[PDB]
Amino acid sequence: STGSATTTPIDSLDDAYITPVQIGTPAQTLNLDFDTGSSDLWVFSSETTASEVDGQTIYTPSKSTTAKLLSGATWSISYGDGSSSSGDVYTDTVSVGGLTVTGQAVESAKKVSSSFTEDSTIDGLLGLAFSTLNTVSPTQQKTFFDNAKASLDSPVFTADLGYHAPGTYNFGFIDTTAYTGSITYTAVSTKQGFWEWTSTGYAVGSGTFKSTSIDGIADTGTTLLYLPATVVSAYWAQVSGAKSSSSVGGYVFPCSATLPSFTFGVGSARIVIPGDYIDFGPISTGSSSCFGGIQSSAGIGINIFGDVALKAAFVVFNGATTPTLGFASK
C-alpha cells in the first residue's frame, strides 16, 4: 500500500509545515508537524490543561470507538529548543493520506510548554526518526513509519517541501516525476536514533567547493540550517554588514542585502540552496535587520540539515534494513 499527503507552511516564512492526519473512528483530523528528528506521535487532546490550549484542534479519545488507553504508560519529551510536553498514551487507528495503521500509539498531552501553546496552527507532532528514541515508558512504542513498513510497497517515505508553497509527503513509493536528474544515496548511521549522514562539503555562492566531512541529521522538524562555526562564518563573511548578534542570538544581516546561495555535497552530487531561502525576514516588525537562515551549531552539539536545506531537494528516507538517505535536485 501507499500514502500521499499535502504539507503546507504555517506562515509566510516557512517556519514549520503541517500535514492533515486522521486519528480515531470516526476520523478526527489534526494538522501535525512531521518531524524526522523525533519519534513520538503526540497531540493536543481533551486531557490537555485548558489554559495551555489556544486554538489548537484537540483529539478526544472518548469519542473514538477504536481508542484504547494503554494502561500505566506515560511519555515525556524535551526538544533541543527547550520545548517539552508530557501525558498518557492511547492506541488508535491513524491514517495519513490514505495509508492506515491500526494500533498506533497516540500520546495524549496533559501538559505542553508555552512555545506549543502559542503555535495555534500545530495540533501535534508525528515523529519519523528511529523508534529507539520514543519516550513512552515503561514500554517503548513504534513510530507510524515503523508500524506501516510491512504493508508499504517499498519501505520508504519522501519529503518534498515547498518554498513558500505546499509540498508532499509520500509513503511507500518514489514519485519519479517530482525531481530532476538522478537520486544520490548516502549512508545513514542510526547509532543516535536520527537520520544521520555525512555531507561531503560546501560552497558559498559561486566560490570554490570545499571538500570536508560534515556529520549532521536530516530534520524536517527544525526550521533552519545549523552548521559548524567555521562554515557559517565563511558564509556570512560574503554578506555586507552581516554580523553575529548576541542579543538576537545569531547572525543577522541588513534586509536590503542580496544573499548568496549555499551548496552542500551529497556524495559526488551538489545541492544548491538559493540565497532567497536563507532570508527569514526582520528580527522585529519594522526592523531593517533581518534574521539569517544559516546559523552556528556550536551551542547545539550536532549539525542539523533543517527545512532550509531539505526544501531545496527531493529527499528519500529509505527505511530498508540498511537505511539510506537519497537527495535529488528539483
Ligand SMILES: NCc1ccc(C(F)(F)F)cc1
Ligand atoms: N526535530 C527534533 C529535534 C530536536 C532537537 C534536536 C537536537 F537539538 F537535539 F539535535 C534534534 C532533533
Ligand SMILES: NCc1ccc(C(F)(F)F)cc1
Ligand atoms: N523540532 C521539534 C519542534 C517542532 C516545533 C516546535 C515549535 F515551534 F512548535 F515549538 C518545537 C520543536
